[model samples]
Target: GVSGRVRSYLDLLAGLSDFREHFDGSDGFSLDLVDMADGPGEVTVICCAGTAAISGPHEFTRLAGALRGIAPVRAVPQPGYEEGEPLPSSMAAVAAVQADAVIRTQGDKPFVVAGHSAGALMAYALATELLDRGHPPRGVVLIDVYPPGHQDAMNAWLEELTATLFVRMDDTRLTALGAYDRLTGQWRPRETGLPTLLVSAGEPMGPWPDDSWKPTWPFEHDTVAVPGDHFTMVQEHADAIARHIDAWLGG
Candidate 1:
């Protein structure tokens, strides 16, 4: 049997085609938002999914579960990756739509922007978008984030993914992967002085490529080390990630 989450995703994908015309009317289309966890904390945490075609809320399930008692968690799956959504022309365009979706749900509540991998760049951009609209988050949480300089490494990683788990992906998803990598390669996140946390992966995937460099945020922030490589850090070690966040947020 299909899992509950995948079923829901399929349902959403199917429904999108039928109601797209209605959505494009005065109401406009809204991005899909995933409610991950509800906790006791006053501040909410909004997660941005990585740009991979196969990446979405599923990637954060473990981390969200681990954060169950620490704070509420939500995820905004990137457009163009699934559900046959239109491709984004630029990061700013996507961020604008994300801002609208967040405003509709979160309202004035205190929230934190969190993301992993390439999503970290979007999270940073989304943070600024929210700030500009007077809905600033408490902080930003980045997990195993790679800087834009790692384009070559990222491209190589994408090739590996395509040859493995993403082998069966359709043309749309494959095209999306290319677009995502290109846009992400060109992204340069600006620093916002908001409280920030960088969850570094203690293990490397391999000897870093010459052009691949460690990320350096221009603002003052805290860095915590978590075991595992880029992908595994958020997989098996998500509990540790949650604990680090829990301590940092003084939960």
Candidate 2:
């Protein structure tokens, strides 16, 4: 199933060349290039996607190559359901598959999960599920994502626009306001002892109201601001990101 998904993603990437052709040879699009056996210890690094449609193999390959030799299991997210549904279960399935692969190959080395954008939310959900099953992850890395409880003050007009544009009237926006509000509200991050790390994209271009969301989690975690806007940051500093991961994994 994963193989098929990888192939499909590759095909999508191939089709993109018809429109100006931006892919350089170094772009990581091949699943075969992922080398998960060279870092600190046997660890699984799960790649999470943003709210975009299915990610192509080129993106996945670049991500995997960036983290190559830094972990054992390198798993990228596969679309797990129809569009616009809850993301928790879908992320859980991806984590389960990575976990199964790791255990099969190395008998359960410490697991570290990472995600980007919406994928970060899914990473948090997967961590919560693993903890619920009595197997918490060693570390959780959230890239360019807001924590569920953080919200900035929004004017009435901004609120109205958010309601009218992004969220439905029934869907309460999760902001970095207060923990109690989030805890009492729906879609709370599950409580666990997992060590958390947040990497935020500083000076993002577009309006990202969720920038303050990182404070929602326990304050006893490492959080850093990397250079660049959200999208370009990842692309331009892929090597820097890889180095960060290597250092985090104690390589």
Best by lDDT: 1
The CA lDDT at 60 in model 2 is 44
Model 2 CA deviation exceeding 4 Å by range:
1-41, 54-60, 76-106, 145-186, 204-219, 229-235
lDDT of 2 by residue, 26-106 (tens): 332212112333455456665543333323223445556666566554544432222322222223344454344334443
Prediction 2 global C-alpha lDDT: 0.46
Clashes of each: 0, 13
Name the TM-score of candidate 2.
0.52
Cα lDDT tens digits for candidate 1, 32-55: 679999889787889998876567
Kindly report which residue pairs in candidate 1 clash with one another.
none
Residue 195 of model 1, lDDT score: 89
Per-model TM-score versus the true fold:
0.74, 0.52
TM-score for candidate 1, residues paired by index = 0.74
Give the residue spans of candidate 1 off by over 4 A.
Answer: 1-27, 145-166, 204-215, 229-235
